[PDB]
Amino acid sequence: FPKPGTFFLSAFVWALIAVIFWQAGGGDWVARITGASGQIPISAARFWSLDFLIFYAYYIVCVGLFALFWFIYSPHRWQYWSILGTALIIFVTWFLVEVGVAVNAWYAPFYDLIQTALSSPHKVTIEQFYREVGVFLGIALIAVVISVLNNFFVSHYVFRWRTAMNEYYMANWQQLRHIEGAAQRVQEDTMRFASTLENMGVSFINAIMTLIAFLPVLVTLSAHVPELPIIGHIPYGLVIAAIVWSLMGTGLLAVVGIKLPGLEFKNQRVEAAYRKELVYGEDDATRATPPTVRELFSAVRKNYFRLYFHYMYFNIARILYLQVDNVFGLFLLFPSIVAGTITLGLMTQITNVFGQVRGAFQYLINSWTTLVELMSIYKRLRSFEHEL
Protein backbone atom coordinates (compact mmCIF):
# COMPACT_ATOMS: atom_id res chain seq x y z
CA PHE A 1 0.00 0.00 0.00
CA PRO A 2 2.01 2.98 -1.26
CA LYS A 3 1.08 5.93 0.99
CA PRO A 4 -2.23 4.45 2.20
CA GLY A 5 -3.80 7.78 3.17
CA THR A 6 -3.37 9.10 -0.35
CA PHE A 7 -3.74 5.64 -1.90
CA PHE A 8 -7.26 4.87 -0.70
CA LEU A 9 -8.56 8.37 -1.46
CA SER A 10 -7.08 8.26 -4.97
CA ALA A 11 -8.60 4.81 -5.48
CA PHE A 12 -12.03 6.10 -4.45
CA VAL A 13 -11.70 9.17 -6.69
CA TRP A 14 -10.71 7.01 -9.67
CA ALA A 15 -13.55 4.57 -8.96
CA LEU A 16 -16.07 7.43 -8.85
CA ILE A 17 -14.70 8.93 -12.08
CA ALA A 18 -14.82 5.57 -13.88
CA VAL A 19 -18.35 4.84 -12.64
CA ILE A 20 -19.54 8.30 -13.71
CA PHE A 21 -18.00 7.91 -17.17
CA TRP A 22 -19.39 4.39 -17.67
CA GLN A 23 -22.87 5.30 -16.44
CA ALA A 24 -22.95 8.07 -19.07
CA GLY A 25 -22.50 8.55 -22.81
CA GLY A 26 -19.26 6.57 -22.70
CA GLY A 27 -20.93 3.31 -21.70
CA ASP A 28 -23.35 3.48 -24.62
CA TRP A 29 -20.66 4.83 -26.96
CA VAL A 30 -18.44 1.79 -26.40
CA ALA A 31 -21.34 -0.49 -27.33
CA ARG A 32 -22.22 1.67 -30.34
CA ILE A 33 -18.67 1.62 -31.71
CA THR A 34 -18.44 -2.08 -30.82
CA GLY A 35 -21.86 -3.40 -31.85
CA ALA A 36 -23.41 -4.49 -28.55
CA SER A 37 -27.10 -4.64 -27.65
CA GLY A 38 -28.91 -4.85 -24.33
CA GLN A 39 -30.01 -8.43 -25.00
CA ILE A 40 -28.24 -10.07 -22.05
CA PRO A 41 -29.35 -13.73 -21.82
CA ILE A 42 -30.39 -15.60 -18.68
CA SER A 43 -28.06 -18.59 -19.10
CA ALA A 44 -24.33 -18.49 -18.34
CA ALA A 45 -23.70 -17.29 -21.91
CA ARG A 46 -24.21 -13.76 -20.59
CA PHE A 47 -20.84 -13.84 -18.81
CA TRP A 48 -19.30 -13.39 -22.20
CA SER A 49 -20.49 -11.76 -25.44
CA LEU A 50 -19.89 -8.10 -26.15
CA ASP A 51 -22.17 -6.67 -23.44
CA PHE A 52 -19.96 -8.06 -20.66
CA LEU A 53 -16.76 -8.22 -22.72
CA ILE A 54 -16.70 -4.45 -23.19
CA PHE A 55 -17.06 -3.97 -19.44
CA TYR A 56 -14.26 -6.45 -18.75
CA ALA A 57 -12.00 -4.57 -21.16
CA TYR A 58 -12.98 -1.23 -19.63
CA TYR A 59 -12.21 -2.46 -16.11
CA ILE A 60 -8.87 -3.83 -17.30
CA VAL A 61 -7.97 -0.52 -18.98
CA CYS A 62 -8.98 1.64 -16.01
CA VAL A 63 -7.16 -0.57 -13.50
CA GLY A 64 -4.12 -0.58 -15.78
CA LEU A 65 -4.08 3.21 -15.92
CA PHE A 66 -4.43 3.44 -12.14
CA ALA A 67 -1.67 0.87 -11.62
CA LEU A 68 0.63 2.65 -14.07
CA PHE A 69 0.11 5.97 -12.29
CA TRP A 70 0.82 4.43 -8.88
CA PHE A 71 3.83 2.49 -10.19
CA ILE A 72 5.40 5.65 -11.60
CA TYR A 73 4.40 7.87 -8.66
CA SER A 74 6.00 5.79 -5.89
CA PRO A 75 7.21 2.22 -6.48
CA HIS A 76 6.61 -0.27 -3.67
CA ARG A 77 7.83 -3.84 -3.24
CA TRP A 78 4.32 -5.28 -2.89
CA GLN A 79 2.84 -3.20 -5.71
CA TYR A 80 1.69 -6.27 -7.68
CA TRP A 81 -0.23 -7.57 -4.64
CA SER A 82 -1.66 -4.38 -3.11
CA ILE A 83 -2.70 -2.54 -6.29
CA LEU A 84 -3.40 -5.32 -8.79
CA GLY A 85 -4.41 -7.92 -6.20
CA THR A 86 -6.97 -5.63 -4.57
CA ALA A 87 -8.38 -4.72 -7.98
CA LEU A 88 -8.74 -8.41 -8.80
CA ILE A 89 -10.48 -9.07 -5.47
CA ILE A 90 -12.92 -6.21 -6.09
CA PHE A 91 -13.61 -7.42 -9.63
CA VAL A 92 -14.26 -10.98 -8.43
CA THR A 93 -16.63 -9.68 -5.75
CA TRP A 94 -18.53 -7.77 -8.44
CA PHE A 95 -18.58 -10.89 -10.63
CA LEU A 96 -20.08 -12.96 -7.81
CA VAL A 97 -22.69 -10.23 -7.29
CA GLU A 98 -23.55 -10.47 -10.99
CA VAL A 99 -23.79 -14.27 -10.76
CA GLY A 100 -26.30 -13.79 -7.95
CA VAL A 101 -28.18 -11.32 -10.14
CA ALA A 102 -28.27 -13.88 -12.97
CA VAL A 103 -29.68 -16.55 -10.64
CA ASN A 104 -32.30 -14.11 -9.35
CA ALA A 105 -33.31 -13.35 -12.94
CA TRP A 106 -33.48 -17.07 -13.72
CA TYR A 107 -35.93 -17.60 -10.84
CA ALA A 108 -38.71 -15.96 -12.88
CA PRO A 109 -39.01 -18.24 -15.96
CA PHE A 110 -38.44 -21.34 -13.82
CA TYR A 111 -41.32 -20.62 -11.46
CA ASP A 112 -43.53 -19.42 -14.30
CA LEU A 113 -42.95 -22.88 -15.80
CA ILE A 114 -43.66 -24.48 -12.42
CA GLN A 115 -46.96 -22.59 -12.16
CA THR A 116 -47.88 -23.61 -15.71
CA ALA A 117 -47.11 -27.27 -14.94
CA LEU A 118 -49.10 -27.21 -11.70
CA SER A 119 -52.06 -25.50 -13.40
CA SER A 120 -53.03 -28.69 -15.28
CA PRO A 121 -51.47 -32.17 -15.05
CA HIS A 122 -49.26 -33.21 -17.97
CA LYS A 123 -49.48 -29.79 -19.60
CA VAL A 124 -45.70 -29.30 -19.31
CA THR A 125 -43.42 -32.15 -20.36
CA ILE A 126 -40.63 -33.10 -17.97
CA GLU A 127 -37.96 -32.29 -20.57
CA GLN A 128 -38.82 -28.59 -20.26
CA PHE A 129 -38.02 -28.98 -16.56
CA TYR A 130 -34.57 -30.46 -17.21
CA ARG A 131 -33.46 -27.69 -19.57
CA GLU A 132 -34.27 -25.04 -16.97
CA VAL A 133 -32.07 -26.90 -14.49
CA GLY A 134 -29.60 -27.35 -17.33
CA VAL A 135 -29.54 -23.56 -17.41
CA PHE A 136 -29.08 -23.02 -13.67
CA LEU A 137 -26.15 -25.43 -13.39
CA GLY A 138 -24.53 -23.53 -16.25
CA ILE A 139 -24.53 -20.45 -14.04
CA ALA A 140 -23.82 -22.37 -10.84
CA LEU A 141 -20.65 -24.03 -12.13
CA ILE A 142 -19.17 -20.57 -12.71
CA ALA A 143 -20.08 -19.54 -9.17
CA VAL A 144 -18.50 -22.84 -8.13
CA VAL A 145 -15.24 -22.11 -9.95
CA ILE A 146 -14.56 -18.40 -9.49
CA SER A 147 -15.43 -18.43 -5.79
CA VAL A 148 -13.03 -21.32 -5.16
CA LEU A 149 -10.34 -19.33 -6.94
CA ASN A 150 -11.34 -16.19 -5.03
CA ASN A 151 -10.98 -17.83 -1.61
CA PHE A 152 -7.58 -18.94 -2.87
CA PHE A 153 -6.28 -15.57 -4.04
CA VAL A 154 -7.66 -13.61 -1.08
CA SER A 155 -5.94 -16.03 1.29
CA HIS A 156 -2.58 -15.66 -0.43
CA TYR A 157 -3.15 -11.91 -0.64
CA VAL A 158 -3.79 -11.81 3.11
CA PHE A 159 -0.61 -13.76 3.80
CA ARG A 160 1.36 -11.36 1.63
CA TRP A 161 0.11 -8.56 3.87
CA ARG A 162 1.44 -10.49 6.86
CA THR A 163 4.75 -10.95 5.08
CA ALA A 164 4.98 -7.26 4.21
CA MET A 165 4.88 -5.81 7.71
CA ASN A 166 6.66 -8.91 9.01
CA GLU A 167 9.47 -7.98 6.63
CA TYR A 168 9.43 -4.60 8.40
CA TYR A 169 8.87 -5.34 12.11
CA MET A 170 11.62 -7.96 12.13
CA ALA A 171 13.78 -5.52 10.16
CA ASN A 172 13.60 -3.18 13.19
CA TRP A 173 13.73 -5.90 15.85
CA GLN A 174 16.83 -4.47 17.54
CA GLN A 175 15.16 -1.10 18.24
CA LEU A 176 11.73 -2.67 18.84
CA ARG A 177 12.57 -5.65 21.07
CA HIS A 178 12.27 -3.67 24.32
CA ILE A 179 8.51 -3.13 23.88
CA GLU A 180 6.31 -5.34 26.05
CA GLY A 181 4.59 -8.17 24.23
CA ALA A 182 6.45 -7.66 20.95
CA ALA A 183 6.30 -11.40 20.24
CA GLN A 184 2.50 -11.38 20.12
CA ARG A 185 2.34 -8.15 18.10
CA VAL A 186 4.76 -9.56 15.50
CA GLN A 187 3.38 -13.11 15.28
CA GLU A 188 -0.24 -13.11 16.48
CA ASP A 189 -1.78 -9.70 15.75
CA THR A 190 -0.37 -9.65 12.21
CA MET A 191 -2.69 -12.32 10.78
CA ARG A 192 -5.58 -11.04 12.87
CA PHE A 193 -5.25 -7.45 11.65
CA ALA A 194 -4.70 -8.40 8.01
CA SER A 195 -7.49 -10.99 7.83
CA THR A 196 -10.03 -8.92 9.76
CA LEU A 197 -9.41 -5.74 7.77
CA GLU A 198 -9.51 -7.57 4.44
CA ASN A 199 -12.71 -9.43 5.36
CA MET A 200 -14.41 -6.24 6.55
CA GLY A 201 -13.42 -4.35 3.40
CA VAL A 202 -14.69 -7.19 1.22
CA SER A 203 -17.97 -7.37 3.15
CA PHE A 204 -18.53 -3.60 2.92
CA ILE A 205 -17.76 -3.54 -0.81
CA ASN A 206 -19.97 -6.59 -1.34
CA ALA A 207 -22.90 -4.96 0.47
CA ILE A 208 -22.53 -1.77 -1.56
CA MET A 209 -22.36 -3.75 -4.81
CA THR A 210 -25.38 -5.88 -3.86
CA LEU A 211 -27.44 -2.75 -3.19
CA ILE A 212 -26.30 -1.07 -6.41
CA ALA A 213 -27.05 -4.20 -8.45
CA PHE A 214 -30.42 -5.04 -6.89
CA LEU A 215 -31.97 -1.57 -6.77
CA PRO A 216 -32.62 -1.43 -10.56
CA VAL A 217 -33.86 -5.04 -10.51
CA LEU A 218 -36.35 -4.15 -7.79
CA VAL A 219 -37.35 -0.93 -9.56
CA THR A 220 -38.15 -2.76 -12.80
CA LEU A 221 -40.14 -5.33 -10.80
CA SER A 222 -42.25 -2.59 -9.19
CA ALA A 223 -44.32 -2.08 -12.35
CA HIS A 224 -46.24 -5.27 -11.49
CA VAL A 225 -47.01 -4.26 -7.88
CA PRO A 226 -49.39 -1.29 -8.21
CA GLU A 227 -50.79 -1.27 -4.66
CA LEU A 228 -49.28 -1.91 -1.23
CA PRO A 229 -51.39 -3.72 1.40
CA ILE A 230 -52.55 -1.09 3.90
CA ILE A 231 -51.16 2.29 2.80
CA GLY A 232 -52.65 1.86 -0.67
CA HIS A 233 -50.96 3.12 -3.82
CA ILE A 234 -47.50 4.65 -3.35
CA PRO A 235 -45.25 5.56 -6.32
CA TYR A 236 -42.40 3.04 -6.47
CA GLY A 237 -44.00 1.52 -3.40
CA LEU A 238 -42.19 -1.82 -3.56
CA VAL A 239 -38.63 -0.47 -3.63
CA ILE A 240 -39.43 2.30 -1.14
CA ALA A 241 -41.01 -0.17 1.29
CA ALA A 242 -38.12 -2.62 0.94
CA ILE A 243 -35.53 0.10 1.55
CA VAL A 244 -37.45 1.52 4.52
CA TRP A 245 -37.94 -1.91 6.09
CA SER A 246 -34.29 -2.87 5.66
CA LEU A 247 -32.90 0.39 7.03
CA MET A 248 -35.47 0.41 9.84
CA GLY A 249 -34.37 -3.06 10.91
CA THR A 250 -30.70 -2.08 10.67
CA GLY A 251 -31.33 1.10 12.66
CA LEU A 252 -33.32 -0.76 15.31
CA LEU A 253 -30.49 -3.28 15.71
CA ALA A 254 -27.80 -0.58 15.75
CA VAL A 255 -29.73 1.51 18.31
CA VAL A 256 -30.57 -1.31 20.72
CA GLY A 257 -26.94 -2.39 20.37
CA ILE A 258 -25.01 0.81 21.05
CA LYS A 259 -24.01 -0.27 24.56
CA LEU A 260 -23.05 -3.80 23.48
CA PRO A 261 -19.54 -2.84 22.22
CA GLY A 262 -18.94 -0.86 25.41
CA LEU A 263 -20.00 -3.75 27.63
CA GLU A 264 -17.83 -6.10 25.56
CA PHE A 265 -14.84 -3.78 25.98
CA LYS A 266 -15.46 -3.67 29.74
CA ASN A 267 -15.48 -7.48 29.68
CA GLN A 268 -12.09 -7.62 27.96
CA ARG A 269 -10.75 -5.03 30.41
CA VAL A 270 -11.79 -6.99 33.51
CA GLU A 271 -10.59 -10.28 32.01
CA ALA A 272 -7.23 -8.67 31.24
CA ALA A 273 -7.00 -7.39 34.82
CA TYR A 274 -7.74 -10.90 36.10
CA ARG A 275 -5.06 -12.42 33.87
CA LYS A 276 -2.57 -9.72 34.88
CA GLU A 277 -3.12 -10.44 38.57
CA LEU A 278 -2.71 -14.16 37.89
CA VAL A 279 0.53 -13.46 36.01
CA TYR A 280 1.83 -11.38 38.92
CA GLY A 281 0.89 -14.25 41.22
CA GLU A 282 2.66 -16.78 38.99
CA ASP A 283 6.23 -16.24 40.25
CA ASP A 284 5.20 -14.86 43.64
CA ALA A 285 3.65 -15.83 46.96
CA THR A 286 2.07 -12.61 48.24
CA ARG A 287 -0.04 -12.13 45.10
CA ALA A 288 -3.28 -13.89 44.12
CA THR A 289 -4.45 -13.53 47.71
CA PRO A 290 -7.95 -15.06 48.01
CA PRO A 291 -9.48 -11.65 48.81
CA THR A 292 -7.91 -10.18 45.66
CA VAL A 293 -8.96 -13.02 43.36
CA ARG A 294 -12.44 -13.03 44.90
CA GLU A 295 -12.86 -9.31 44.23
CA LEU A 296 -11.52 -9.65 40.68
CA PHE A 297 -13.86 -12.53 39.89
CA SER A 298 -16.78 -10.62 41.40
CA ALA A 299 -15.97 -7.81 38.97
CA VAL A 300 -15.82 -10.36 36.13
CA ARG A 301 -19.19 -11.78 37.24
CA LYS A 302 -20.87 -8.37 37.23
CA ASN A 303 -19.38 -7.31 33.90
CA TYR A 304 -20.47 -10.53 32.18
CA PHE A 305 -23.95 -10.42 33.74
CA ARG A 306 -24.54 -6.88 32.47
CA LEU A 307 -23.67 -7.97 28.93
CA TYR A 308 -25.86 -11.07 29.24
CA PHE A 309 -28.75 -8.82 30.28
CA HIS A 310 -28.34 -6.29 27.45
CA TYR A 311 -27.86 -8.97 24.80
CA MET A 312 -31.34 -10.16 25.78
CA TYR A 313 -32.88 -6.93 24.47
CA PHE A 314 -30.64 -6.99 21.40
CA ASN A 315 -31.59 -10.62 20.72
CA ILE A 316 -35.29 -9.84 21.11
CA ALA A 317 -34.92 -7.16 18.46
CA ARG A 318 -32.85 -9.31 16.09
CA ILE A 319 -35.02 -12.44 16.36
CA LEU A 320 -38.28 -10.51 15.98
CA TYR A 321 -36.89 -8.72 12.92
CA LEU A 322 -35.78 -12.00 11.33
CA GLN A 323 -39.10 -13.74 12.02
CA VAL A 324 -41.10 -10.83 10.57
CA ASP A 325 -38.77 -10.55 7.56
CA ASN A 326 -39.40 -14.23 6.86
CA VAL A 327 -42.86 -13.20 5.56
CA PHE A 328 -42.63 -9.44 4.97
CA GLY A 329 -41.69 -10.08 1.34
CA LEU A 330 -44.95 -11.94 0.76
CA PHE A 331 -46.92 -9.48 2.89
CA LEU A 332 -45.89 -6.69 0.53
CA LEU A 333 -47.13 -8.78 -2.43
CA PHE A 334 -50.45 -10.01 -0.99
CA PRO A 335 -52.65 -7.50 -2.92
CA SER A 336 -50.82 -8.35 -6.15
CA ILE A 337 -51.37 -12.06 -5.49
CA VAL A 338 -55.07 -11.44 -4.85
CA ALA A 339 -55.54 -9.17 -7.87
CA GLY A 340 -53.47 -11.39 -10.17
CA THR A 341 -50.91 -8.81 -11.29
CA ILE A 342 -47.81 -10.94 -10.65
CA THR A 343 -47.14 -14.60 -11.39
CA LEU A 344 -45.27 -17.19 -9.32
CA GLY A 345 -41.98 -16.31 -11.01
CA LEU A 346 -42.26 -12.59 -10.33
CA MET A 347 -43.20 -13.26 -6.70
CA THR A 348 -40.22 -15.57 -6.19
CA GLN A 349 -37.86 -13.12 -7.91
CA ILE A 350 -39.11 -10.27 -5.70
CA THR A 351 -38.66 -12.39 -2.58
CA ASN A 352 -35.11 -13.29 -3.65
CA VAL A 353 -34.28 -9.63 -4.29
CA PHE A 354 -35.64 -8.75 -0.85
CA GLY A 355 -33.52 -11.43 0.81
CA GLN A 356 -30.32 -10.37 -0.95
CA VAL A 357 -30.90 -6.68 -0.17
CA ARG A 358 -31.55 -7.63 3.47
CA GLY A 359 -28.22 -9.45 3.53
CA ALA A 360 -26.55 -6.39 2.03
CA PHE A 361 -27.90 -4.19 4.82
CA GLN A 362 -27.10 -6.92 7.37
CA TYR A 363 -23.38 -7.02 6.51
CA LEU A 364 -22.88 -3.69 8.30
CA ILE A 365 -24.41 -5.01 11.53
CA ASN A 366 -22.61 -8.35 11.25
CA SER A 367 -19.26 -6.55 10.98
CA TRP A 368 -19.82 -5.23 14.52
CA THR A 369 -19.19 -8.76 15.83
CA THR A 370 -15.44 -8.30 15.29
CA LEU A 371 -15.24 -4.52 14.80
CA VAL A 372 -14.23 -4.22 18.46
CA GLU A 373 -11.50 -6.82 17.97
CA LEU A 374 -10.18 -5.13 14.83
CA MET A 375 -10.11 -1.72 16.53
CA SER A 376 -8.27 -3.19 19.52
CA ILE A 377 -5.74 -4.89 17.24
CA TYR A 378 -5.11 -1.69 15.29
CA LYS A 379 -4.71 0.25 18.54
CA ARG A 380 -2.19 -2.32 19.78
CA LEU A 381 -0.23 -2.18 16.51
CA ARG A 382 -0.25 1.64 16.46
CA SER A 383 1.02 1.83 20.05
CA PHE A 384 3.61 -0.85 19.24
CA GLU A 385 4.99 0.99 16.20
CA HIS A 386 4.69 4.47 17.75
CA GLU A 387 7.30 3.85 20.46
CA LEU A 388 9.88 3.15 17.72
Epitope: P226, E227, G232, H233, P235
Partner: nanobody, 114 residues
Framework: VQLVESGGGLVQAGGSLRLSCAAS????????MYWYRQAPGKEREWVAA????????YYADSVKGRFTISRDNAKNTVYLQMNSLKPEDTAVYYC????????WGQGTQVTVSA
Protein backbone atom coordinates in the same frame (compact mmCIF):
# COMPACT_ATOMS: atom_id res chain seq x y z
CA VAL B 1 -70.52 2.29 -7.85
CA GLN B 2 -71.86 0.77 -11.08
CA LEU B 3 -69.18 0.53 -13.76
CA VAL B 4 -70.71 0.85 -17.23
CA GLU B 5 -68.22 0.00 -19.99
CA SER B 6 -69.07 1.04 -23.56
CA GLY B 7 -66.13 0.56 -25.91
CA GLY B 8 -66.90 -2.76 -27.54
CA GLY B 9 -66.96 -3.56 -31.22
CA LEU B 10 -65.40 -5.54 -34.04
CA VAL B 11 -61.94 -4.36 -35.10
CA GLN B 12 -59.70 -5.94 -37.72
CA ALA B 13 -56.13 -6.94 -36.95
CA GLY B 14 -53.60 -4.14 -36.58
CA GLY B 15 -56.16 -1.52 -35.58
CA SER B 16 -56.99 0.78 -32.66
CA LEU B 17 -59.83 1.04 -30.15
CA ARG B 18 -60.80 3.01 -27.05
CA LEU B 19 -62.64 1.57 -24.05
CA SER B 20 -64.38 3.47 -21.26
CA CYS B 21 -65.47 2.68 -17.69
CA ALA B 22 -67.95 5.47 -16.97
CA ALA B 23 -68.88 5.15 -13.29
CA SER B 24 -72.24 6.22 -11.86
CA UNK B 25 -72.28 5.62 -8.09
CA UNK B 26 -69.86 6.77 -5.42
CA UNK B 27 -67.20 9.14 -6.84
CA UNK B 28 -63.94 7.27 -7.44
CA UNK B 29 -61.06 9.75 -7.24
CA UNK B 30 -59.12 8.08 -4.41
CA UNK B 31 -59.12 4.61 -6.01
CA UNK B 32 -56.89 2.63 -8.36
CA MET B 33 -58.87 1.54 -11.42
CA TYR B 34 -58.14 -1.92 -12.82
CA TRP B 35 -58.69 -3.21 -16.36
CA TYR B 36 -58.92 -7.00 -16.74
CA ARG B 37 -59.67 -9.23 -19.71
CA GLN B 38 -61.09 -12.73 -20.07
CA ALA B 39 -59.98 -14.76 -23.07
CA PRO B 40 -62.52 -17.04 -24.79
CA GLY B 41 -62.58 -20.19 -22.68
CA LYS B 42 -59.76 -19.13 -20.35
CA GLU B 43 -59.23 -17.33 -17.04
CA ARG B 44 -59.39 -13.61 -16.38
CA GLU B 45 -56.11 -11.76 -16.86
CA TRP B 46 -54.75 -8.46 -15.61
CA VAL B 47 -54.31 -5.88 -18.38
CA ALA B 48 -53.75 -2.48 -16.78
CA ALA B 49 -54.02 -0.41 -13.61
CA UNK B 50 -54.13 3.34 -13.00
CA UNK B 51 -53.52 5.34 -9.82
CA UNK B 52 -55.78 8.01 -8.29
CA UNK B 53 -54.12 10.62 -10.51
CA UNK B 54 -53.50 9.84 -14.16
CA UNK B 55 -49.74 9.80 -13.64
CA UNK B 56 -48.68 6.25 -12.68
CA UNK B 57 -49.93 3.58 -15.08
CA TYR B 58 -49.03 -0.10 -14.73
CA TYR B 59 -49.29 -2.58 -17.60
CA ALA B 60 -49.21 -6.35 -17.93
CA ASP B 61 -45.99 -7.90 -19.18
CA SER B 62 -47.76 -9.03 -22.37
CA VAL B 63 -49.48 -5.73 -23.27
CA LYS B 64 -46.77 -3.34 -22.06
CA GLY B 65 -45.85 -0.64 -24.56
CA ARG B 66 -49.01 -1.08 -26.65
CA PHE B 67 -52.02 -0.46 -24.40
CA THR B 68 -52.31 2.98 -22.79
CA ILE B 69 -54.49 3.60 -19.72
CA SER B 70 -55.45 7.11 -18.62
CA ARG B 71 -57.93 8.78 -16.28
CA ASP B 72 -60.52 11.52 -16.76
CA ASN B 73 -61.43 12.40 -13.18
CA ALA B 74 -63.92 15.10 -14.16
CA LYS B 75 -66.31 12.57 -15.70
CA ASN B 76 -65.20 9.77 -13.33
CA THR B 77 -63.93 7.56 -16.16
CA VAL B 78 -60.85 5.51 -17.00
CA TYR B 79 -59.94 5.13 -20.67
CA LEU B 80 -57.95 2.32 -22.28
CA GLN B 81 -56.57 3.11 -25.74
CA MET B 82 -55.46 -0.21 -27.24
CA ASN B 83 -53.60 -0.22 -30.57
CA SER B 84 -51.44 -2.63 -32.58
CA LEU B 85 -54.06 -5.30 -31.96
CA LYS B 86 -52.66 -8.79 -32.41
CA PRO B 87 -55.13 -11.53 -33.39
CA GLU B 88 -54.58 -13.01 -29.91
CA ASP B 89 -55.97 -9.83 -28.30
CA THR B 90 -59.61 -10.93 -28.55
CA ALA B 91 -61.43 -11.23 -25.23
CA VAL B 92 -64.11 -9.70 -23.02
CA TYR B 93 -62.73 -6.65 -21.21
CA TYR B 94 -63.84 -5.85 -17.65
CA CYS B 95 -63.32 -2.82 -15.42
CA UNK B 96 -62.76 -3.30 -11.69
CA UNK B 97 -62.73 -1.06 -8.62
CA UNK B 98 -62.73 -1.62 -4.85
CA UNK B 99 -64.98 0.75 -2.89
CA UNK B 100 -65.70 -1.12 0.33
CA UNK B 101 -66.42 -4.19 -1.79
CA UNK B 102 -65.30 -5.35 -5.22
CA UNK B 103 -67.18 -3.75 -8.12
CA TRP B 104 -67.00 -5.38 -11.56
CA GLY B 105 -68.46 -3.92 -14.72
CA GLN B 106 -70.21 -5.64 -17.61
CA GLY B 107 -67.57 -6.72 -20.09
CA THR B 108 -67.15 -5.44 -23.62
CA GLN B 109 -66.45 -8.03 -26.31
CA VAL B 110 -63.33 -7.01 -28.26
CA THR B 111 -62.90 -9.22 -31.33
CA VAL B 112 -59.97 -9.16 -33.75
CA SER B 113 -59.76 -11.21 -36.95
CA ALA B 114 -56.46 -11.95 -38.68
Amino acid sequence: VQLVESGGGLVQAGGSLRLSCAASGFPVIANVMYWYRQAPGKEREWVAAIDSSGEYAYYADSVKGRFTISRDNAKNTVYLQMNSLKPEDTAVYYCYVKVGSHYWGQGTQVTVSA
